[PDB]
Amino acid sequence: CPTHADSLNNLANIKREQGNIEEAVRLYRKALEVFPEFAAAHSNLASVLQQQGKLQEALMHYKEAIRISPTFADAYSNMGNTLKEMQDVQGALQCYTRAIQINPAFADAHSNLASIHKDSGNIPEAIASYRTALKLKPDFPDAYCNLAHCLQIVCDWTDYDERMKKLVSIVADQLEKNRLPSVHPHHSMLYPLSHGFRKAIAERHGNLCLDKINVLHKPPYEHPKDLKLSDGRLRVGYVSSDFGNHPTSHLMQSIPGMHNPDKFEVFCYALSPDDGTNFRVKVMAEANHFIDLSQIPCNGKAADRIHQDGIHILVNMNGYTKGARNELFALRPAPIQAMWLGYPGTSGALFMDYIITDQETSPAEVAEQYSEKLAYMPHTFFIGDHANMFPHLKKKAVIDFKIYDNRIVLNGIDLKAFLDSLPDVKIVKMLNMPVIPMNTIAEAVIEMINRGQIQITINGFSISNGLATTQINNKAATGEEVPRTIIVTTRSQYGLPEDAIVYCNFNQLYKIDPSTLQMWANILKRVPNSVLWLLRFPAVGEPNIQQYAQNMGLPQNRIIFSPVAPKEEHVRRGQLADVCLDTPLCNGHTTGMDVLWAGTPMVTMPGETLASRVAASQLTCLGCLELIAKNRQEYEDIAVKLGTDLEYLKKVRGKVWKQRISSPLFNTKQYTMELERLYLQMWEHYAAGNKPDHMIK
């Protein structure tokens, strides 16, 4: 009977929409039992199987649906989603284009094709496809919300206010009707949503992991109640898909090795394969135990492995980012599970116990926005490996081409040795700063930059054009290795004016909103000789910023764009700027540390979300409270003062330059020790028989 089968299929679609996935699977299967050649049932069953993490089984049923019905467009589009999840981009593309070929009016297929363009970095094409999807189906939350993020990326602010209004109403309606919100947890920081909505969004995405582990039917793990199996050592497991060339490793790659081997046993669990970088090599070498979980794709077997190691504290460094396997944490293989560093927000999930943060980043008055208990580090929870990765930026010298501290800059490990070979250096009491006079050697260096030469040799010392690092040493340019030569960095290299204040921001452009640019234009207008230094991140966002700046009163020549550079050049060229203007909507985090290590003062205005407060926490630990604004006026006034009071600028720049070293901000050893105290606080609380509570010291 078709009717018996049709009713079972339709009822299963209902169960699926209600979030009852188990019952949906059951009813689809009973439909196929009645009517085995049921194309819709095969495709629908494959959708919920995909949602349960059973990807290969899903593919089988999609193909069966297509055999039965060769022009079943829904099956092609749904199959593509599975292939995309399996990282088979080409396969996904071919399914989407096929479905669209079968039915050009298929809105879902256009929206799914758009997501591929988006994830490939082809934003204009993603935008066009999302608009085609919305044109065919105006009520389409996934298409609208992802379009909104596309427009955010390229700083398209057309009808921005109506866009926010729509986004919030979409989330509201979706939460009320118990749907998976079309706004991603990470993206929710960018929109004017309540804290309640943001945590709810995170909670729903956490639920997706529960769907994938319920099918495993694993029992609760037993957990260690002492440190006797581990000889009194606390067993800590760090779980990350980012052990390699990723901002995460650029922050904490030294931490596993800094740990006290007398009290701690470090297990690193990698969710990604080896990329061959020195970043991956270091962690593998310095951790007590390194486990490649990308060899164990079954979350059941993987979580089994973690549990066999006897982990006391398991650390989530991914959150809701690519490469995450949060199913591992949902299975609770460890008695204590904490979020750390990788994800700037709450998991919203019950399977997480703590978020490691600090008082400045996550004050008690806003603890409501987190589902975890707060675990305070004594200063900032943030850390960087800059002291290890870029020690060549610890000292610097300049050339008097006329005394500026950021017009023509030299750095190098062997810089002091080179300066000793020069009989006419002046030491300007600012640490102090060596100045090379405009002599034969200075002329040769400036000639190299002007003629675009790669590298010259002076007194046996290699002097490198800062723009040519990849041509000289790839590993040095990526930060895998410390540069060996003396590098030259000039404002002429990036078309920056010699006689003007340079305000910079090296974040991705999505972090900028119309409110922020307004605030920047106010500052530029009050500092006559000043430019704004931004990155083509991505480049297609450039004409948008330029146009909106015109509408705010800024001529185009006031804004200077540079391309994104290799890691080392990016950190180093921050020395050329006078002041960094931080983005209030979402701060620089890694790039915040990048700027401060260059000795550049950063002006910030902390908001309510975690992501909007990280810069203020960094500056607090750094010891520069005068760079922290309490509102937009104060933000503007601080920035305008630094740009106009040049003695105050000299004082503040000098302060930051000294404090990179003397403050605990880049001190990975002091960090690791403090992090160990927090771990022990966590463990004793549990070992004494307590459920997690705020470890706010």
């Binding site: 799914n112 389409f140 991603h184 980012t321």
Partner: peptide, 20 residues
């Protein structure tokens, strides 16, 4: 190349088919 950043995969939309 372009810098590796903190990245997130864009969600897709499954289509449920009703039998009529």
């Amino acid at each position: 190349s372009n810098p590796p950043c903190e990245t997130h995969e864009t969600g897709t939309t499954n289509t449920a088919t009703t039998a009529t």
